[PDB]
């Protein structure tokens, strides 16, 4: 079986750079808390004991209240008088930093308003090894720079708003089937372990880790360590994750805290570097611990030190107020026991955070639609004399928006996949609602909405006498403890929902104007459609949350161009993506082995390395006018020479081989500050191009910048760079980004470094990942 | 919740069926999920201690209800002798080398827990348990000291004997006729026999 | 819709089991709805007077399907000789008082039907209508000269007689088996036997 080296010991922190303050003040606090008290900072309460999906034990010596964690990436779960964002998948849609940090200030504002310390977002974990993954659809995208940039934005909004993000989950959590035992034991599975996660050190490197190394960077104040095993070796006790790769190598200053009842080897958990178990025998244990020498005290004082250090980093004792909502019900009030009877105490204070958040939740909505095909039928006027609207995915949820349990069902317009990746919408505008709207507020002219997809007669009625046909189609997943329609999280299928290809069939027939709208959670199977003439548009829209049906009129109707990209790869086949997940346990009644053989390959890699033609390609988006691309220009920078990283840490302070040892300890060569070594970040080279927006409408362009490192193992292309850019018609610019070190260097395991290797790397610049327009080589120095 | 019932109420009522149980020399009790007078059943010393094994001096075990509420250790005292489904068995002992919890305790616990055993003459009836009872598959996966083996969990033992019959029997026996004007009984010589509703069927689900 | 069929085909296919059922002395046939070669059967003299009353020299006689389309009058001249289920009678009857349809041919319809009826010996065998189509109720009101009447409209005749026999072994004898590597004849003494699908089941509206 494959084996997880130790590393110890668990490394304490070093307070320097962006850290410094909040590490002094951590200090300070901490330097004044009993053994006990220090314990109660690293304890969950109990599952569903207080009003936080997570909480904390108190200090109330020093009048310090518990910390609340809450879900989700998309927003507030649970409270009321929130708003529902669009999806991280809709984000990496929008490849637009911008709009990623607008969002990101957005949800930190409503968490801090709510009284909520920690958002437990965003995600880079799963990447999205897997098209059918569960989850993949509250991260971002395949790609590890998309993801791993647009994790860093998001991060910076809500820590700017006052409130700890929460980067999760680490590592390699790729699907859901198997992440626990329990879960598995009730989909009829003999298991005792989680799946073991078996990937090696320069695919942990090149692929996984890179999104979370730029979290680091981006001083995400706390992680959150997986389900899964990593090599056999549970996350949230796996030393060689947490001590060496997160808090060596990536230099990590914050604080780890598990999944919910992510196993983990109790007190020794503590000695591989997690510093809080949620939610919640940990506390007695590690006290117990502490008192007998199993566990230093200056490992104790790191974990309350690193805990108090995220506190202090966004300033939540200058914006923490009272958690004003209950996680476990909307009563306004409820009883809470005394040390005498009870106290009847006010529960919901229903605090409308909302703001105008609606506002960014449309532009993000927008900015997210991918226009794939278009053959004349974008833009709509609202002067069609027939519109017909098609498919259940474009009506209400008969349950009301809110009316299904974690958004567990498929009920209604698809704006937000299932289970704690979640938030209650307070409305939610549907296609049908936007589409009337729009006709009836222009030309008036007919529409009818046909949302039951078995409803097939009227919709060729329908179809047959409208001048466009909108239909609309969704695919869903979710987190795994929800099973809808035989998709235990994970999709079963790359098929449309709810016979959604047969909609398309039967309008696209009736009709030779027929739109069709996606909204999947990831890649569905198009081939038997796509290519039909009478479908003269495609577009995805994705998981919009609230404001879905106004974000996508805005587009269809020509308010806005589209100017998304698709952040995965639509292919011919599931097999085009590569192999199946793992549903079916493979090592008896124990941990299920999942081999990452692929490696780096997944998504739009493998497509490349196979040589096999995508239906739609990685980073591919059609606009309402269209871009030129010339004069691509390298400029080597003469970058200081890479040193590896040398030294030692301080000694461990007070307020297995190695695991009590608070000696200095030698830096990595790979390590030395948060991110890793900060000669990774030198620039190497400056790139140009310019772009010219060559049609009659204003629109954006997603230039997006690749790069062959040309090795026999590398991909043909990576993904380094990208923006999006607006431009009138006629209207150049100049793209200017530069190639870090990073950029261009492969990880090498001898020698535990990044390394630029004696290949010839070759830089492109174009419109896709497929339509690389201008090349031209990196010239070695 | 607390079930509220008075002494005279829990004689004349509830507790006379248990003591016709403990007569008949019935070798287990299973004691409640719920409180009584403000006691969960597999603590309550009154109903354990006074009621079933002095009053009505029950010679047999008591086990919970499955994770039934007790005072862990204390639940011993008030005179449970058996934790289901099951850290009792580290607190007891500990509680024993401590004196918490007396030597004759847990002496009498599994006593009365071996009592039964040899009642009912267990000793001579015992074989394997030959079924599982989470799954119906033959065989599955269990861990061993080293590695795993693949084990057979189902013999598929039939134990249905003759045992329709009596099924058959004391259903018909079951049966109350509360109105009969004229209708009962048929004879099978009937020119059209209607049958109606959902309930006279099959599920159809297996 | 007009099939349209060569005489060739008509012959050596289609044509060819009617023919033997001339020959068994069937009494009647029924034409379709159907147009054949743009003529419908009802009224179609290549078919009827031509191909079933010369060439198979039938000697019952033929009725329409039940609206099935005809030139009135004129189907009569074409070889139709029962209009079901039923203007014509009017038609017919001016039609011969006015010499368009010739006295024999109405005198030729008449005799096959009541040839058909002495064939079979209806004459011995008729026994009065005992039941109603339309309804299952025991009486019905009808029309009279004056008022109406309550009448029995249906007697409950029982004529199954013994036929679930020969439907038993109808259905055995008509059990075709066209796969078998070794899953047949079961014994009934399987262990487990499951049955699935809705077609084993019931009709659950009786
Ligand atoms: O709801 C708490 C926790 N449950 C388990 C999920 O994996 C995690 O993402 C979530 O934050
Ligand atoms: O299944 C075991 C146990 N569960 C709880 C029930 O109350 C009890 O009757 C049963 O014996
Ligand atoms: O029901 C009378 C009549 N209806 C029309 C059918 O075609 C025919 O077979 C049937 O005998
Ligand atoms: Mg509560
Ligand atoms: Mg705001
Ligand atoms: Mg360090
Ligand atoms: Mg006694
Ligand atoms: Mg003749």
Same mark, same amino acid.
């Given at each position: 079986?494959?084996?997880?080296?130790?590393?110890?010991?668990?490394?304490?922190?070093?307070?320097?750079?962006?850290?410094?303050?909040?590490?002094?003040?951590?200090?300070?606090?901490?330097?004044? $808390?009993?053994?006990?008290?220090?314990?109660?900072?690293?304890?969950?309460?109990?599952?569903?004991?207080?009003?936080?999906?997570?909480?904390?034990?108190?200090?109330?010596?020093?009048?310090?209240?518990?910390?609340?964690?809450?879900?989700?990436?998309?927003?507030?779960?649970?409270?009321?008088?929130?708003?529902?964002?669009?999806?991280?998948?809709?984000?990496?849609?929008?490849?637009?930093?911008?709009?990623?940090?607008?969002?990101?200030?957005?949800?930190?504002?409503?968490?801090?308003?709510?009284?909520?310390?920690?958002?437990?977002?965003?995600?880079?974990?799963?990447?999205?090894?897997?098209?059918?993954?569960?989850?993949?659809?509250?991260?971002?995208?395949?790609?590890?720079?998309?993801?791993?940039? $647009?994790?860093?934005?998001?991060?910076?909004?809500?820590?700017?708003?006052?409130?700890?993000?929460?980067?999760?989950?680490?590592?390699?959590?790729?699907?859901?089937?198997?992440?626990?035992?329990?879960?598995?034991?009730?989909?009829?599975?003999?298991?005792?372990?989680?799946?073991?996660?078996?990937?090696?050190?320069?695919?942990?490197?090149?692929?996984?880790?890179?999104?979370?190394?730029?979290?680091?960077? @981006?001083?995400?104040?706390?992680?959150?360590?997986?389900?899964?095993?990593?090599?056999?070796?549970?996350?949230?006790?796996?030393?060689?994750?947490?001590?060496?790769?997160?808090?060596?190598?990536?230099?990590?200053?914050?604080?780890?805290?598990?999944?919910?009842? @992510?196993?983990?080897?109790?007190?020794?958990?503590?000695?591989?570097?997690?510093?809080?178990?949620?939610?919640?025998?940990?506390?007695?244990?590690?006290?117990?611990?502490? $008192?007998?020498?199993?566990?230093?005290?200056?490992?104790?004082?790191?974990?309350?030190?690193?805990?108090?250090?995220?506190?202090?980093?966004?300033?939540?004792?200058?914006?923490?107020?009272?958690?004003?909502?209950?996680?476990?019900?909307?009563?306004?009030?409820?009883?809470?026991?005394?040390?005498?009877?009870?106290?009847?105490?006010?529960?919901?204070?229903?605090?409308?955070?909302? @703001?105008?958040?609606?506002?960014?939740?449309?532009?993000?909505?927008?900015?997210?639609?991918?226009?794939?095909?278009?053959?004349?039928?974008?833009?709509?006027?609202?002067?069609?004399?027939?519109?017909?609207?098609?498919?259940?995915?474009?009506?209400?949820?008969?349950?009301?928006?809110?009316?299904?349990?974690?958004?567990?069902?498929?009920?209604?317009?698809?704006?937000?996949?299932?289970?704690?990746?979640?938030?209650?919408?307070?409305?939610?505008?549907?296609?049908?609602?936007?589409?009337?709207?729009?006709?009836?507020?222009?030309?008036?002219?007919?529409?009818?909405?046909?949302?039951?997809?078995?409803?097939?007669?009227?919709?060729?009625?329908?179809?047959?006498?409208?001048?466009?046909?909108?239909?609309?189609?969704?695919?869903?997943?979710?987190?795994?403890?929800?099973?809808?329609?035989?998709?235990?999280?994970?999709?079963?299928?790359?098929?449309?929902?709810?016979?959604?290809?047969?909609?398309?069939?039967?309008?696209?027939?009736?009709?030779?104007?027929?739109?069709?709208?996606?909204?999947?959670?990831?890649?569905?199977?198009?081939?038997?459609?796509?290519?039909?003439?009478?479908?003269?548009?495609?577009?995805?829209?994705?998981?919009?949350?609230?404001?879905?049906?106004?974000?996508?009129?805005?587009?269809?109707?020509?308010?806005?161009?589209?100017?998304?990209?698709?952040?995965?790869?639509?292919?011919?086949?599931?097999?085009?993506?590569?192999?199946?997940?793992?549903?079916?346990?493979?090592?008896?009644?124990?941990?299920?082995?999942?081999?990452?053989?692929?490696?780096?390959?997944?998504?739009?890699?493998?497509?490349?390395?196979?040589?096999?033609?995508?239906?739609?390609?990685?980073?591919?988006?059609?606009?309402?006018?269209?871009?030129?691309?010339?004069?691509?220009?390298?400029?080597?920078?003469?970058?200081?020479?890479?040193?590896?990283?040398?030294?030692?840490?301080?000694?461990?302070?007070?307020?297995?081989?190695?695991?009590?040892?608070?000696?200095?300890?030698?830096?990595?060569?790979?390590?030395?500050?948060?991110?890793?070594?900060?000669?990774?970040?030198?620039?190497?080279?400056?790139?140009? @191009?310019?772009?010219?927006?060559?049609?009659?409408?204003?629109?954006?362009?997603?230039?997006?910048?690749?790069?062959?490192?040309?090795?026999?193992?590398?991909?043909?292309?990576?993904?380094?760079?990208?923006?999006?850019?607006?431009?009138?018609?006629?209207?150049?610019?100049?793209?200017?980004?530069?190639?870090?070190?990073?950029?261009?260097?492969?990880?090498?395991?001898?020698?535990?470094?990044?390394?630029?290797?004696?290949?010839?790397?070759?830089?492109?610049?174009?419109?896709?990942?497929?339509?690389?327009?201008?090349?031209?080589?990196?010239?070695?120095?």
């Amino acid at each position: 079986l494959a084996y997880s080296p130790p590393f110890y010991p668990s490394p304490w922190m070093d307070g320097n750079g962006e850290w410094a303050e909040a590490y002094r003040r951590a200090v300070d606090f901490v330097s004044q $808390l009993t053994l006990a008290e220090k314990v109660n900072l690293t304890t969950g309460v109990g599952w569903m004991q207080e009003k936080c999906v997570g909480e904390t034990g108190s200090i109330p010596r020093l009048g310090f209240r518990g910390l609340c964690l809450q879900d989700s990436p998309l927003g507030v779960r649970f409270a009321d008088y929130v708003s529902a964002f669009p999806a991280g998948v809709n984000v990496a849609a929008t490849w637009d930093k911008n709009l990623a940090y607008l969002r990101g200030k957005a949800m930190g504002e409503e968490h801090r308003g709510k009284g909520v310390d920690v958002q437990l977002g965003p995600v880079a974990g799963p990447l999205g090894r897997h098209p059918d993954g569960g989850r993949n659809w509250e991260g971002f995208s395949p790609d590890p720079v998309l993801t791993g940039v $647009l994790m860093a934005e998001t991060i910076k909004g809500i820590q700017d708003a006052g409130v700890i993000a929460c980067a999760k989950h680490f590592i390699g959590n790729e699907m859901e089937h198997f992440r626990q035992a329990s879960e598995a034991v009730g989909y009829g599975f003999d298991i005792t372990e989680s799946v073991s996660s078996n990937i090696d050190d320069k695919t942990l490197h090149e692929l996984y880790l890179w999104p979370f190394a730029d979290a680091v960077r @981006a001083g995400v104040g706390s992680f959150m360590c997986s389900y899964n095993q990593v090599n056999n070796s549970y996350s949230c006790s796996n030393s060689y994750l947490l001590n060496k790769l997160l808090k060596s190598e990536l230099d990590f200053q914050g604080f780890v805290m598990s999944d919910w009842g @992510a196993h983990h080897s109790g007190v020794g958990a503590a000695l591989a570097g997690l510093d809080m178990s949620m939610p919640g025998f940990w506390g007695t244990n590690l006290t117990i611990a502490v $008192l007998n020498g199993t566990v230093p005290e200056w490992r104790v004082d790191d974990m309350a030190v690193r805990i108090m250090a995220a506190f202090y980093k966004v300033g939540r004792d200058r914006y923490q107020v009272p958690v004003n909502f209950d996680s476990w019900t909307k009563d306004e009030y409820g009883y809470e026991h005394a040390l005498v009877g009870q106290n009847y105490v006010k529960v919901n204070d229903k605090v409308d955070v909302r @703001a105008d958040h609606a506002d960014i939740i449309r532009q993000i909505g927008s900015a997210s639609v991918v226009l794939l095909k278009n053959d004349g039928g974008l833009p709509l006027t609202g002067y069609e004399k027939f519109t017909g609207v098609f498919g259940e995915d474009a009506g209400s949820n008969r349950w009301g928006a809110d009316g299904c349990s974690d958004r567990g069902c498929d009920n209604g317009t698809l704006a937000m996949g299932w289970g704690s990746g979640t938030a209650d919408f307070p409305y939610l505008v549907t296609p049908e609602q936007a589409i009337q709207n729009e006709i009836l507020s222009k030309g008036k002219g007919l529409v009818s909405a046909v949302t039951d997809n078995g409803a097939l007669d009227q919709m060729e009625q329908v179809a047959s006498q409208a001048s466009v046909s909108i239909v609309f189609v969704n695919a869903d997943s979710g987190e795994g403890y929800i099973n809808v329609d035989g998709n235990e999280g994970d999709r079963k299928n790359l098929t449309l929902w709810k016979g959604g290809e047969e909609v398309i069939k039967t309008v696209a027939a009736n009709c030779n104007n027929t739109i069709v709208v996606m909204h999947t959670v990831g890649p569905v199977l198009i081939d038997e459609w796509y290519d039909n003439p009478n479908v003269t548009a495609i577009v995805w829209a994705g998981l919009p949350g609230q404001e879905s049906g106004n974000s996508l009129v805005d587009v269809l109707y020509g308010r806005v161009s589209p100017g998304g990209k698709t952040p995965f790869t639509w292919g011919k086949t599931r097999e085009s993506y590569g192999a199946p997940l793992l549903t079916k346990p493979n090592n008896g009644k124990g941990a299920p082995q999942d081999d990452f053989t692929e490696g780096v390959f997944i998504d739009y890699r493998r497509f490349d390395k196979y040589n096999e033609t995508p239906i739609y390609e990685f980073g591919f988006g059609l606009s309402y006018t269209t871009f030129e691309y010339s004069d691509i220009y390298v400029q080597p920078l003469n970058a200081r020479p890479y040193t590896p990283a040398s030294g030692s840490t301080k000694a461990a302070p007070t307020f297995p081989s190695g695991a009590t040892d608070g000696s200095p300890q030698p830096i990595l060569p790979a390590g030395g500050a948060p991110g890793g070594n900060p000669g990774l970040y030198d620039e190497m080279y400056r790139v140009s @191009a310019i772009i010219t927006n060559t049609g009659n409408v204003v629109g954006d362009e997603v230039p997006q910048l690749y790069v062959s490192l040309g090795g026999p193992d590398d991909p043909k292309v990576v993904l380094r760079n990208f923006d999006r850019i607006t431009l009138h018609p006629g209207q150049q610019t100049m793209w200017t980004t530069t190639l870090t070190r990073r950029d261009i260097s492969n990880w090498d395991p001898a020698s535990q470094n990044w390394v630029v290797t004696k290949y010839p790397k070759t830089v492109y610049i174009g419109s896709s990942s497929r339509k690389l327009h201008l090349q031209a080589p990196l010239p070695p120095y």
